[PDB]
From a paper:
Viral determinants of virulence and transmissibility are still poorly understood, although lysine at position 627 of the polymerase subunit PB2 (PB2-627K) is now known to be important for avian influenza virus adaptation to mammals. Here, we report that a basic amino acid at position 591 of PB2 can compensate for the lack of PB2-627K and allows efficient replication of highly pathogenic H5N1 and pandemic H1N1 viruses in mammalian species. Our data indicated that a basic amino acid at PB2-591 can compensate for PB2-627K in mammalian adaptation; interestingly, these two residues are positioned near each other on the surface of PB2.
To address this critical question, we present here the high-resolution crystal structure of the C-terminal domain of PB2 from a 2009 H1N1 pandemic virus (A/Mexico/InDRE4487/2009); the PB2 proteins of A/Mexico/InDRE4487/2009 and Cal04 are identical in the region crystallized; i.e., amino acid residues 538–741. The PB2 protein of the pandemic H1N1 virus shows an altered polar surface when compared to the avian H5N1 PB2-627K protein. Interestingly, our structure of the pandemic H1N1 PB2 protein reveals that PB2-591R fills the cleft found in H5N1 PB2 proteins in this area (compare Fig. 4A and 4B). In particular, the side chains of R591 and S590 in the structure of H1N1 PB2 occupy what would otherwise be the positively charged cleft in the H5N1 PB2. PB2-591R is located 4 Ångstrom from PB2-627E, with the side chain of R591 rotated away from PB2-627E and participating in hydrogen-bonded and water-mediated hydrogen bond networks with the main chain carbonyl backbone between residues A587 and T588, even though the two residues have space to assume rotomers that could form a neutralizing salt bridge. The R591 residue in H1N1 PB2 thus affects both the shape and charges on the surface of the protein, which may affect its interaction with other viral and/or host factors. Our H1N1 structure shows that while the side chain of PB2-590S is in close proximity (<4 Ångstroms) to 627E, the hydroxyl moiety points away from the glutamatic acid and does not participate in hydrogen bonds or polar interactions with the side chains of 591R or 627E. Furthermore, the side chain atoms of PB2-590S also protrude into the positively charged cleft and may provide a steric platform that reduces the conformational flexibility of neighboring residue 627E. These findings suggest that PB2-590S constrains any side chain at position 627. Our X-ray crystal structure of the C-terminal portion of a pandemic H1N1 PB2 protein reveals changes in surface shape and charge created by PB2-591R which may prevent an inhibitory host factor as suggested by Mehle & Doudna from binding to PB2, hence allowing efficient influenza virus replication.
Residue numbers in the entry: 541 to 741
Amino acid sequence: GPESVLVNTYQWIIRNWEIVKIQWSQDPTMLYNKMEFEPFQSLVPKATRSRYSGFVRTLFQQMRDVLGTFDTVQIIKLLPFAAAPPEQSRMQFSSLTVNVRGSGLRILVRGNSPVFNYNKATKRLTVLGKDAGALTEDPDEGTSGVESAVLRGFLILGKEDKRYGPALSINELSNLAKGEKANVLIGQGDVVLVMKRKRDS
């Protein structure tokens, strides 16, 4: 069933992470088009599939372009959304819908959610209340706290910094100049400092 499709997709990515990481790094196009992501894509609503994919593919390229910000879990989380033919847009998506429990459940782009829950204490991924397997320590993992694959055209720099003013919503960022910093209401009471990048991916 649909719940098992999600679990099995993420399980598959983890089991095959050595080759998936390599392709993600050097031939993402042939990774994104793998048939193994088609069942997951069937669960992504037809109307938003392509925009989700353009968004995610752009976020992944930010990660490649902004050196030393590799985030293993973020790649695994978002990867299956990259499989649809991409469509461009200006929008920020804070969450991505999958059709599972008879209905839309949303995976949060930043951090854990009920659908996608990575446990840093146990090093295991849980997807819809099911184990999707263990992650191994990767020396390439970014340790600086800069998040390059959450917002399209922005880096999350770290904690709220009151100097840069009161928080903007995700939908209020489009007037920021290249290189300008602001506080942003990223989710769940969390305010983070962000920077609009000068060059887009």
